[PDB]
Amino acid sequence: NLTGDIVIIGAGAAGSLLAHYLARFSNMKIILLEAGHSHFNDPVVTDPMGFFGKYNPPNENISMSQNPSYSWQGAQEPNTGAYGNRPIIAHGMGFGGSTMINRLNLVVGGRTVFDNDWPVGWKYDDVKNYFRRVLVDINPVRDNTKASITSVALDALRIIAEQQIASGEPVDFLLNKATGNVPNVEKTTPDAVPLNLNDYEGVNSVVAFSSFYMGVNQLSDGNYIRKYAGNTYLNRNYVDENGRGIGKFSGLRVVSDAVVDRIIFKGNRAVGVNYIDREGIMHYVKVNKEVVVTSGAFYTPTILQRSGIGDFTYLSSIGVKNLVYNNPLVGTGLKNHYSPVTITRVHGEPSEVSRFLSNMAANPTNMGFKGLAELGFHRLDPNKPANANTVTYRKYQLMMTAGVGIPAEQQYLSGLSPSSNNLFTLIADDIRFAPEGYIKIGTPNIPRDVPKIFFNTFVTYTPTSAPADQQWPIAQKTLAPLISALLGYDIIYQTLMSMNQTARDSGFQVSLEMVYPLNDLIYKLHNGLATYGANWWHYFVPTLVGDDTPAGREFADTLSKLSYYPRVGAHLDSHQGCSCSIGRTVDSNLKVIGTQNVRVADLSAAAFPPGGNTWATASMIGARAVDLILGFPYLRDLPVNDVPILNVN
Amino acid sequence: NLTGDIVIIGAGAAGSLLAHYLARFSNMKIILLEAGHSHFNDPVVTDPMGFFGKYNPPNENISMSQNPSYSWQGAQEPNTGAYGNRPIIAHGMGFGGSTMINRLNLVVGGRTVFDNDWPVGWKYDDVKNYFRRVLVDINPVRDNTKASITSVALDALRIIAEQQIASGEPVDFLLNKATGNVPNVEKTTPDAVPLNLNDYEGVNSVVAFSSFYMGVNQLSDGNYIRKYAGNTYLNRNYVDENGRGIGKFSGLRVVSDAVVDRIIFKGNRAVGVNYIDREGIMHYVKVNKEVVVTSGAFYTPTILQRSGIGDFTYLSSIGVKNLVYNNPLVGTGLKNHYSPVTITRVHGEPSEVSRFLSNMAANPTNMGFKGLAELGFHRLDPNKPANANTVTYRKYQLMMTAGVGIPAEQQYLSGLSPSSNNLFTLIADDIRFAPEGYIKIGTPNIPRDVPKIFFNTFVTYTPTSAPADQQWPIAQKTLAPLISALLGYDIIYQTLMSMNQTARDSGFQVSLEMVYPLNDLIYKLHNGLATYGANWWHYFVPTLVGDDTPAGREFADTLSKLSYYPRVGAHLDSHQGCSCSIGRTVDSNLKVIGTQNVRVADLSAAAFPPGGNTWATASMIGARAVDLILGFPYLRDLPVNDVPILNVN
Numbered sequence A, B: 001n002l003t004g005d006i007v008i009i010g011a012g013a014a015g016s017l018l019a020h021y022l023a024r025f026s027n028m029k030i031i032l033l034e035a036g037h038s039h040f041n042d043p044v045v046t047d048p049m050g051f052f053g054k055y056n057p058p059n060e061n062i063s064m065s066q067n068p069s070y071s072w073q074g075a076q077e078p079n080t081g082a083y084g085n086r087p088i089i090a091h092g093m094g095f096g097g098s099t100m101i102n103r104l105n106l107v108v109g110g111r112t113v114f115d116n117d118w119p120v121g122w123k124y125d126d127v128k129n130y131f132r133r134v135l136v137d138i139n140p141v142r143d144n145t146k147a148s149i150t151s152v153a154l155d156a157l158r159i160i161a162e163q164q165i166a167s168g169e170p171v172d173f174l175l176n177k178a179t180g181n182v183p184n185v186e187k188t189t190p191d192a193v194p195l196n197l198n199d200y201e202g203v204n205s206v207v208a209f210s211s212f213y214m215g216v217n218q219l220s221d222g223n224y225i226r227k228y229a230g231n232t233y234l235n236r237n238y239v240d241e242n243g244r245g246i247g248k249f250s251g252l253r254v255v256s257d258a259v260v261d262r263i264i265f266k267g268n269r270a271v272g273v274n275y276i277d278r279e280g281i282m283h284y285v286k287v288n289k290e291v292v293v294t295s296g297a298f299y300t301p302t303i304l305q306r307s308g309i310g311d312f313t314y315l316s317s318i319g320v321k322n323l324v325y326n327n328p329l330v331g332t333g334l335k336n337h338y339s340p341v342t343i344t345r346v347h348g349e350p351s352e353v354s355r356f357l358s359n360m361a362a363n364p365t366n367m368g369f370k371g372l373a374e375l376g377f378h379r380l381d382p383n384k385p386a387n388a389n390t391v392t393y394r395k396y397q398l399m400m401t402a403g404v405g406i407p408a409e410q411q412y413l414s415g416l417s418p419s420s421n422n423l424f425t426l427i428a429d430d431i432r433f434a435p436e437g438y439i440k441i442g443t444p445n446i447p448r449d450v451p452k453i454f455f456n457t458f459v460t461y462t463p464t465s466a467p468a469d470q471q472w473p474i475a476q477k478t479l480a481p482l483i484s485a486l487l488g489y490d491i492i493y494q495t496l497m498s499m500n501q502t503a504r505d506s507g508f509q510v511s512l513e514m515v516y517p518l519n520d521l522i523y524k525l526h527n528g529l530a531t532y533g534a535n536w537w538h539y540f541v542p543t544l545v546g547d548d549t550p551a552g553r554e555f556a557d558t559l560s561k562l563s564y565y566p567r568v569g570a571h572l573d574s575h576q577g578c579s580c581s582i583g584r585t586v587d588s589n590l591k592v593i594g595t596q597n598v599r600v601a602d603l604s605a606a607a608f609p610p611g612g613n614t615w616a617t618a619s620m621i622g623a624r625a626v627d628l629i630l631g632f633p634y635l636r637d638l639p640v641n642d643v644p645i646l647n648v649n
């Protein structure tokens, strides 16, 4: 049998990093078990554009996240907040996990969220060097192509930011505490300095910029390669084609196509791990010291559950025989981000529209993103943290892309065609998305793509018989996701209105019109915000409001109709996390509560979703686990100019 | 250390029956392996109303077919014919397979399909006694409640049938060859004789009736029980609590919660089967004579594929190590039925609309079904079999239910609320559904809920630069499912128009209006059919017609808009089959081609979908397999008064 000191389950964002550095910094036997295999010669993976379907066979034109050979297919239970829909969300399956198949937008997530929403020992100053490590190992690039529309948008945000700052209003979506009197918006002059949303000390909590950072590297021939956790940490300089570590890393063993079932215990000590190879043959891996689970937010809790760690009453009820530790929180607290989509039409002469929409095409250095911002709370969002006026929280990630990013059914219903060259997309991604779900294995025998995944989003509030005044604080919480999504629309509406001015100022003879969701509805929403102020959202529940005026009914109707759009004019993000989080399933040392020697070190350990895309945070947790397991800050202390050497093969 | 002569994988409609009679009629060791377990003490299953959610916990209100503890979750790949949608279709998981979780409508499927679309040796006179056996073993019941609307509908169909008959038209949807001059519509007089769609000699190919037959039995206390393959064949009179067969059935052994991986071969002979128990422990089952695979249309081929039987080039590409026989047809030819939904509004005084819609509520004896028919081809369907004028083919199953059976998103968009008591549902289920798909495992290691399942339905036809006359036969095939679905709408439109006359004749002061799909669009469809006749469907491809008149353009628009409704105003049936069919993956003796001793005996073996719900055919195939394996018509010859004795525990 295979025997290791530390046995790691899942070679994803966290597991790949963890394995690599444990081997480098210890004399221990490290075993990494991964369900998939390496894709170092697969252009679908190695070419960043493969993500967009560049190498898809025409008769099987599906993305990696839709393809069972490339991913786990996490089909969730009917979404009561979106007409019973059942989105299928992936974890990548191979060396690098989801970073093998993701869109490569590398975002740390900001200082504020770690300082406030994560526990002692996990504050931003505790993790910033691990984040720095994660970033320098990848060495992401900025967009190689400046688009005029990006400067027009920035200048529009500059204006709004100025409006908000001047008003003295304590919280609004472009305010940033750390940057004093000046709009924290990137300048659009010739030699403008880029603003860096990932700035080391976290100054740029709320910030507008021309470019995100993509996890790609340019090769000496000028081509780009996906630079992800798989090829960064498990390439042929470090692990040979048979999975055996090389030189200083010879303590490492990576087992490809090893589908782990469960962890075997003696009392509350893990002593072994079972997996099944591609021949359907079962193997036992002996564990000398620790097991670390890094199988992603959906699956890490399912491994723990099958292994006997979780809700005993439920596990017993479905026939899990060997029970180890009762913790009903295992798999609960599932979080994600969520991206409603808006579409804008640019009016004017064709040549002028064309010029205005030029230089937006996706390439590896930008993955389609032409800006724009990490934004704060809208002033009219009633659900801000208690101290939101004294520290700046991230609430939306604002993205601009070419094309028409709504689902095909919505393109049909709206009449907005992806082949119309006068349309483009803006997305205010809710990155403090209020819904919470949970994961439960349905059966005890084997890992399955489809455990029970409950994640309900834009649910309705059903009035009770209690006095209205007692109900409003309940409705406020229930409606939080709808409230935030509609405010996201208004943010975008505001931005476009200012772009109508800044486009002209920059010499473009064009006008911009928000056309998805319906212009008339957004117009009405904007007017309602001004009319009803803070309690505007009461009109989500008209039977409790008691405004039987034509105006009141119309505004209720406007919110009713608008509630449709975040439900289906949208995509659920693949940023699932927090299902085994610090303080609930594991302690601050990432040790699974009730066990001697099991840890969780992937995004499922995250205490609260980062303010932006989740790859960085997932690897960061793995990074910290290296130093937690070895008992000294080896990885934190590693100089930043010492980075893994990339071997393409 | 299990050893059996016949090892059967999957206790479904086919497997349960097969196991039971093989044990009864032989002295062999029969082993049945099932991924799930028995639910004989589970009211969700045993109470027929449990299907509709009667015992759902309110916080996890999901149907059995949505629940991973009760079913396999077959999430298919994006449907190119329905906006990339990914419906998740179940196979039941437990004693009885899908009959454990289905809606219990027991339909043979008619003589015509077996006589014409099934090969020699599988014609209707070959299978009719096996069908009779499947039926008597269940002993299904008729609807215990007469509803007036049913009689109104029947009389309306009577009229239309008379007119079709009178017209001398060779094929139309209410014509039935075997019944001469008279409409084959059940009479509505006081002492009317029920018409039986499952009549032994298959006279009633096309037929309208007041009641389907539900797989339920009434107990002596008056309560109803689900009567399905699980409790019929594997109850405690036959199999004890440890899975050991009793008395005459003592050669049978049923292993519960046994998730089978693959079949082990020595050359092309199966010698073993692997499975994993609920503790994750792998077991080898030795095979003395034969393996029979009965794991359902989605999963039977995935077992064969992991076992090395399928497309060698594909299987190697995803890591299947042991290759046994090259047959690329394995898993191809997937078929299903498909149910677009229509909604009708009933106009008139409330007490009169209410009187008219009374007695429609679902109970165990009807499972919501209040009629109505097995219908033939619409006269204007260009895709009839060559001999459709000389023998009567089933094309639609017409069902009437109370309520609003469109999906929740469509209820919202349409403004048709499930709480409106003046609405009801009619469905023309396409049971000669043209689309064809296929199943391919994504990974080699273990069974998965989610192999690749490609099933594209209402795909578009893209005009080329070739002459019109040369393109039309292609478009005719490509558009076949839309054509048939829209003609289903016209059938119902016709039916409702005649119901407006018969409702009045029957003393109801009401009017009926089709309101989903939009009344205006259906009105325009009906008129276009009359105007353009046989080539009406050319207007699906307006650029090829070259009719630039306002009338022509409007009809093109009408068909365009209507094409939306079968795509999303519908449900994909759970009647998946034919993925390992006779003549492609197995021979007419159900032996897997290329193997000495493996058979497929479930619905995946079906040569062509039955004309109606598929449980009966699935059990029929298993029934025949008994006699094929034992080498004599033992089960065929068993007197119909000898049936399994039911034990509830």
Ligand SMILES: Cc1cc2nc3c(=O)[nH]c(=O)nc-3n(C[C@H](O)[C@H](O)[C@H](O)COP(=O)(O)OP(=O)(O)OC[C@H]3O[C@@H](n4cnc5c(N)ncnc54)[C@H](O)[C@@H]3O)c2cc1C
Binding pocket: A009, A010, A011, A012, A013, A014, A015, A033, A034, A035, A036, A065, A090, A091, A092, A093, A094, A095, A096, A097, A098, A099, A101, A102, A103, A104, A105, A106, A107, A258, A259, A260, A261, A294, A295, A296, A297, A299, A447, A574, A575, A576, A602, A603, A604, A613, A614, A615, A616, A618, A619
């Ligand atoms: C389509 C898509 C787009 C995304 N876009 C971005 C983006 O642009 N930017 C960004 O920051 N984030 C994005 N993400 C999210 C990000 O990639 C993940 O959040 C991050 O990888 C999480 O890392 P992880 O270690 O926690 O889990 P994962 O990266 O998902 O790794 C899990 C690993 O565990 C393995 N595993 C699971 N079960 C088993 C088992 N039983 N046995 C053995 N191995 C097992 C899996 O195969 C997998 O390799 C995207 C994700 C997806 C799917």
Ligand SMILES: Cc1cc2nc3c(=O)[nH]c(=O)nc-3n(C[C@H](O)[C@H](O)[C@H](O)COP(=O)(O)OP(=O)(O)OC[C@H]3O[C@@H](n4cnc5c(N)ncnc54)[C@H](O)[C@@H]3O)c2cc1C
Binding pocket: B009, B010, B011, B012, B013, B014, B015, B033, B034, B035, B036, B065, B090, B091, B092, B093, B094, B095, B096, B097, B098, B099, B101, B102, B103, B104, B105, B106, B107, B258, B259, B260, B261, B294, B295, B296, B297, B299, B447, B574, B575, B576, B602, B603, B604, B613, B614, B615, B616, B618, B619
């Ligand atoms: C929700 C629903 C509604 C339906 N409604 C109707 C209806 O009203 N009328 C009707 O006639 N038909 C209906 N059906 C369809 C009908 O039930 C099926 O067509 C019929 O049961 C098919 O029988 P089968 O033997 O081919 O496979 P199944 O009945 O589906 O049984 C397959 C069995 O194989 C087992 N299995 C699969 N993989 C493995 C493995 N690796 N190891 C061990 N065991 C395995 C499964 O657990 C299952 O028990 C419905 C089906 C569903 C799911």
